[PDB]
Design a binder for this molecule. Structure first.
Ligand code: SF4
Ligand code: SF4
Ligand code: SF4
Ligand code: FES
Ligand code: FES
Ligand SMILES: [Ca+2]
Lengths: 148, 905, 156
């Protein structure tokens, strides 16, 4: 992208200069927290910070800094290309957009599928994951990773 | 702002967090990680209170009282069941891995964790599994390290890094395996590492010097005193047991030394407990050595004094105001000689003239932390006046504090303060002969001889105001640096200029005074600070007298056949050979001192004086504040043979026996009234502390805690009959627990901090009007002089550029914190800490001499061909030799002197 | 006895070029030293503190805080097997038992020759193909205990 005029100086000729870097972490679970992500980005220990002050005003190196997930930044260009009301017209739910859902752990077909909001959790287990495996029963489930 | 605690309406300061807002009113909330000086980080989670936003609110929310601002209209509950249960749970969680080490712990009865374990009412242990352990590091001769007792409250790393500026203490480890220390073993090289023994709430960092001869806190007999190891005069609490000084603790002074001492003043007390010290008066007939008690010694001294035509007295900047005045009134006004040399006295008189005549307000040590731009001319503060260096660090971080406060961040959110101010900090420009310990934060460091530092100061003063005398011959690069310093100092709001008599030059002080005057002329709130050498240098300069050279030439010419040397070694301000000749020539030498000085062989009479732990007196610090230091113990309680009295008492009884042939042991109040009567300019020392008739509702003030132990058995080895306890007729304190030490008593002199349920050094919170601010009912000690209405003129005598003469080597002073004090180097704990005596050379001059580092170079000064190993100093300027002052055989009077015959031998 | 080489120092300086603070390149500096030397020895902490200018206590805290910044010597290859919840449902304990039976050591210990260093690690981000195991740069999914000896022979 830097070679073909999309990253660097004078992107497309608008007059906006943006530099993009990859900071590979050293493997700590608490680094995912936004203030701890800022702390580890500055080369310090990944201890989280007090909020307020929130990172949007005094974040990385005391500068305004916005921390976002990968899926939000992957959601934004579809909004910017195909419009706003189209993005509001994907599902008839209060939480607009499409979420990458999927069941995992001793299911028939564990995987990852992009589904709209409001799809029931039984549909992901049955229509996509196929339910439990051979000779297995269902006891419990946990929606949002280990911290749920 | 107005808050509501349990239905009670309290008026608080709305710019403060809730924790010390409640602690100011006397409301007990358990806390570990918060400190009044460091700030809030919200780590220990112990300060939980239940907050309500409406007056009718049932649920509320458990919020951190150290992290919630005390705004107008907050209804917090402390003694609620949910908050109390959570605080007990936090104490329990901290008690899961804590070792069973309380009897064998140096902070038993001084532990913050013990107070907060009993405060939350947690006494039942249902944790049944194993406890984590950690190894220990050897942190040096001062700090004993026991990591098992830690609770991970992060106070040590916060203080040592974000406050003290140290780089060797850090936080390592993992989830629960958190370690706090160095990456390896070795000495903590910060000059403020001693405050870790009271910053740490647990017994991790402890005083090793106290741990050698250890006693519990209730066994200590405390007193309020002033630290004698340099001129800053930080207030300390010496505490003794069994007749020897056990531990120097910090004493809260909201204007000088609020929460922090330095290591020289905290661990340098070991000279008091030396067995070589004179404890009885000893008289010589030839080679025969006899011991007298006080009366026959006084009568014989008066007889020999009457049998002489002129008695002269050599005082000392180490002794108190009253003892020097007693010597002055004993020997006469014209025959009183200050023990310092001519150059040191000239610099001291110039510093006093700039202070009490220059028209520029000299700030106190607490007030230094608010000044914007700091210019240090000549003075190596961190090794001489270290607490001023710590306050300089605070004033430097004040810029990040200002940008944080501009972004609507409260002052106690210290993490946000260093978050916004990443590396931006206030300008600091230090000048020295070499690199300093303030170079990590200094905006610029000028490594040059004292003539070039003085010329830099004169250049700054001229480039500020054109009426100042200009110096011509500055290189354009140094001119650009001059312009940078000028732009930084002129654009500030509270500039500070720090100089002193330790630079070894007079023109440095003149240049600093001219810079301060030029800053004052532009309409700025400028302050100045001269750091003197000894504790009572300023008082001796205020009183005045002759120099040591004049006293020595009076002794050598024969006009003085009797000399009384008060608390002076005489080799620190003059050459040893000349002093020995002038003392062997004189037919009577009377040394009144508490230390075995080298001149006591020449002394015909030796009078055992008392040190700061055994004497009362007044000392004047470097900012003109008179401060009274009190007696800790009577030396004759345990050793009944000991005749060891106050030096002013010795000299006053000698004066009375010389006049009227009667022995009259006086009182401190009489001597204080005599000083404020005969000397108008020392009249403020009457207001330094109240007299011996001062009572708190009829009773005196206790020197020992209410649970002092072993009254009927600590002297039972000598005699089973316990004698009458000693009576203190001089001061308002008593050598007993029958006294007043409540935190709400109308007094300013506090011997020690103790409150019911508060045994730690955090018990000082009850003794203040607001927590972290001034002491309640005012801080002790008053300033001797005010700021003058008009100031001095421009000092016109600029110096010349340093041209290195061949053969002669200018001596550059390299002061060390451990070793440059006369009494602190006598402590046996400093011998394992002080560096080896190295002569410091430029690489160019060492290559010219052909000497490499490690080899010995012999130098001769007045017939003393003394050899020293060589260290290479790149920052030292060519033509100089770097010498450590205050060491063995190297006096501080050697600064600025020449050095011929510098050959490899 | 430590001294940074040319490549490590130049890479460290290039990482300082990426940020506005030399402190921010401490993690990547430690990762560079770990990649070159296998781990971060004691003198490397002071060398990194010298090149970045930050105190050595800060470098020590950063190095000991993160799990995959090794502060102790390891073998030729570091096995990092996932022990989290999804692989526990998928049965990582069989693979742990297989590795313990093969290498004849415990998780956290090294073999006497210095071949493999077995360590548990957090979630590898590949839970749909659990259980997984991350050897030095290769991840392995859909593991079975019987395939452990065939898997360990591809690293001499
Ligand atoms: S630090 Fe306090 S709680 Fe811990 S062992 Fe010592 S006295 Fe007991
Ligand atoms: S060593 Fe002391 S000051 Fe440091 S975190 Fe532990 S308890 Fe707190
Ligand atoms: S700065 Fe000076 S007066 Fe204060 S504790 Fe240190 S040696 Fe004593
Ligand atoms: S005192 Fe508030 S969390 Fe420690
Ligand atoms: S739980 Fe093992 S890869 Fe995620
Ligand atoms: Ca007394």
């Amino acid at each position: 992208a830097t070679e073909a005029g999309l990253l660097g100086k004078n992107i497309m000729g608008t007059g906006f200069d943006f530099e993009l870097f990859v900071h590979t972490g050293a493997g700590r679970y608490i680094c995912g927290e936004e203030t701890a992500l800022i702390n580890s980005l500055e080369g310090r220990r990944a201890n989280p910070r007090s909020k307020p002050p929130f990172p949007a005003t005094s974040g990385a190196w005391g500068k305004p800094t916005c921390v976002n997930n990968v899926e939000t930044l992957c959601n934004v260009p579809a909004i910017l290309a195909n419009g706003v009301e189209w993005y509001q017209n994907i599902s008839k739910s209060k939480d607009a957009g499409t979420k990458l859902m999927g069941f995992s752990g001793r299911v028939k077909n564990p995987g990852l599928w992009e589904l709209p909001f409001g799809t029931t959790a039984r549909e992901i287990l049955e229509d996509y994951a196929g339910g439990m495996r051979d000779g297995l029963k269902f006891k419990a489930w946990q929606p949002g990773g280990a911290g749920t | 702002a107005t808050i509501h605690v349990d239905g009670k309406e309290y008026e608080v300061n709305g710019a403060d967090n809730l924790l010390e807002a409640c602690l100011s009113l006397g409301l007990d909330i358990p806390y570990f990680c918060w400190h009044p000086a460091l700030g809030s980080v919200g780590a220990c989670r112990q300060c939980a209170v239940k907050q309500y936003q409406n007056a009718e609110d049932t649920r509320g929310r458990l919020v951190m009282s150290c992290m919630t601002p005390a705004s107008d209209g907050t209804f917090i509950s402390i003694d609620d069941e949910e908050a109390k249960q959570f605080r007990e749970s936090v104490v329990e969680w901290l008690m899961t891995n804590h070792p069973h080490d309380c009897p064998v712990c140096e902070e038993g009865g001084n532990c913050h964790l013990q107070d907060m374990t009993v405060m939350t009412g947690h006494s039942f242990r249902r944790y049944r599994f194993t406890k984590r352990t950690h190894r220990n590091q050897d942190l040096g001769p001062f700090i004993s390290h026991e990591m098992n007792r830690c609770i991970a409250c992060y106070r040590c790393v916060r203080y040592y890094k974000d406050y003290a500026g140290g780089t060797d203490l850090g936080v390592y480890g993992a989830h629960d395996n958190v370690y706090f220390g160095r990456p390896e073993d070795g000495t903590l090289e910060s000059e403020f590492s001693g405050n870790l023994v009271e910053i740490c709430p647990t017994g991790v960092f402890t005083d090793k010097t106290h741990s050698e001869r250890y006693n519990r806190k209730w066994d200590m007999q405390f007193a309020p005193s002033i630290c004698q190891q340099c001129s800053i005069g930080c207030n300390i609490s010496p505490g003794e047991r069994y007749g020897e000084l056990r531990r120097i603790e910090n004493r809260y002074n909201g204007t000088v030394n609020h929460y922090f001492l330095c290591d020289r003043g905290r661990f340098g007390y070991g000279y008091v407990n030396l067995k070589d010290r004179p404890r009885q008066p000893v008289q010589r007939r030839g080679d025969d050595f006899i011991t007298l008690n006080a009366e026959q010694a006084m009568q014989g001294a008066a007889d020999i004094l009457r049998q002489s035509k002129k008695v002269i007295g050599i005082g000392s900047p180490r002794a108190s105001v009253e003892s020097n005045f007693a010597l002055r009134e004993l020997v006469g006004e014209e025959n009183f000689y200050t023990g310092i040399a001519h150059g040191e006295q000239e610099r001291l008189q110039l510093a006093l003239k700039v202070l009490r005549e220059g028209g520029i307000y000299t700030p106190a040590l607490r007030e230094i932390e608010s000044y914007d731009a700091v210019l240090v001319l000549g003075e190596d503060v961190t090794q001489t006046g270290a607490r001023v260096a710590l306050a300089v660090r605070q004033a430097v971080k004040g810029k990040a504090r200002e940008m944080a406060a501009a972004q609507k961040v409260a002052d106690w959110q210290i993490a946000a303060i260093l978050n916004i101010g990443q590396r931006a900090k206030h300008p600091l420009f230090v000048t020295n002969v070499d690199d300093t310990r303030l170079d990590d934060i200094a905006a610029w460091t000028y490594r040059a001889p004292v003539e070039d530092q003085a010329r830099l100061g004169f250049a700054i003063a001229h480039a500020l105001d054109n009426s100042a005398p200009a110096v011509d011959g500055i290189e354009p690069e140094l001119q650009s640096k001059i312009d940078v310093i000028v732009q930084a100092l002129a654009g500030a709001k509270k500039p500070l200029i720090i100089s002193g008599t330790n630079a070894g030059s007079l023109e440095v002080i003149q240049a600093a005074a001219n810079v301060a005057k030029a800053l004052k002329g532009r309409g700025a709130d400028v302050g100045i600070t001269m750091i003197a050498r000894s504790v009572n240098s300023m008082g001796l300069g205020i009183m005045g007298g002759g120099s040591l050279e004049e006293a020595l030439t009076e002794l050598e010419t024969g006009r003085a056949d009797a000399v009384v040397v008060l608390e002076n070694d005489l080799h620190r301000h003059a050459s040893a050979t000349r002093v020995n000749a002038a003392l062997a020539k004189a037919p009577l030498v009377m040394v009144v001192d508490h230390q075995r000085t080298a001149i006591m062989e020449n002394a015909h009479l030796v009078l055992s004086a008392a040190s700061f732990a055994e004497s009362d007196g007044t000392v004047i610090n470097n900012e003109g504040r008179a401060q009274r230091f009190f007696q800790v113990y009577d030396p004759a309680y345990y050793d009944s043979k000991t005749v060891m009295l106050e030096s002013w008492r010795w000299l006053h009884s000698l004066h009375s026996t010389l006049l009227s042939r009667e022995v009259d042991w006086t009182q401190l109040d009489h001597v204080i009234d005599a000083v404020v009567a005969k000397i108008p300019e020392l009249a403020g020392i009457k207001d330094a502390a109240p007299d011996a008739t001062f009572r708190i509702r009829g009773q005196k003030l206790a020197r020992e805690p209410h649970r002092y132990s072993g009254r009927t058995a600590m002297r039972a080895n000598i005699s089973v009959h316990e004698p009458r306890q000693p009576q203190d007729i001089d001061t308002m304190f008593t050598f007993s627990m029958e006294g007043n030490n409540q935190p709400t008593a109308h007094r300013s002199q506090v011997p020690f901090a103790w409150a019911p349920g508060w045994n730690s050094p955090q018990a000082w919170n009850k003794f203040q009007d607001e927590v972290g601010g001034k002491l309640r009912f005012g801080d002790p000690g008053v300033r001797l002089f005010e700021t003058s209405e008009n100031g001095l003129d421009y000092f016109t005598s600029v110096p010349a550029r340093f041209q290195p003469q061949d053969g002669k080597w200018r001596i550059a002073p390299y002061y060390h914190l451990f070793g440059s004090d006369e009494l602190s180097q006598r402590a046996p704990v400093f011998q394992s800490r002080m560096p080896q005596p190295y002569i410091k050379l430029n690489p160019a001059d060492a290559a010219k001499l052909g000497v490499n580092a490690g080899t010995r170079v012999s130098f001769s000064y007045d017939g003393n061909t003394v050899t020293l190993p060589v260290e290479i100093a790149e920052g030292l300027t060519a033509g100089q030799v770097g010498l450590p002052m205050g060491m063995s055989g190297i006096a501080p009077v050697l600064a600025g002197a020449h050095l011929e015959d510098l050959k490899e031998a | 006895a430590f001294e940074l080489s040319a490549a490590e120092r130049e890479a460290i300086e290039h990482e300082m070029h990426h940020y506005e603070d030399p402190r921010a390149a401490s993690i990547e500096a430690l990762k560079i030293v770990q990649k070159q030397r296998g781990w971060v020895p004691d003198g490397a902490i002071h060398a990194i503190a010298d090149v970045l200018g930050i105190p050595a206590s800060d470098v020590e805290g950063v190095a000991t805080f993160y799990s995959q910044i090794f502060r102790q010597p390891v073998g030729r290859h570091v096995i990092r097997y996932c022990d989290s919840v999804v692989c526990h449902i998928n049965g990582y304990q069989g693979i742990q038992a297989a590795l313990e039976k093969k290498l004849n050591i415990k998780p956290g210990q090294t073999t006497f020759d210095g071949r493999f260093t077995l360590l548990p690690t957090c979630c590898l981000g590949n839970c749909d193909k659990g259980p997984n195991m991350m050897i030095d740069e290769d991840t392995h999914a859909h593991l079975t205990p019987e395939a452990i000896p065939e898997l360990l022979e591809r690293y001499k």
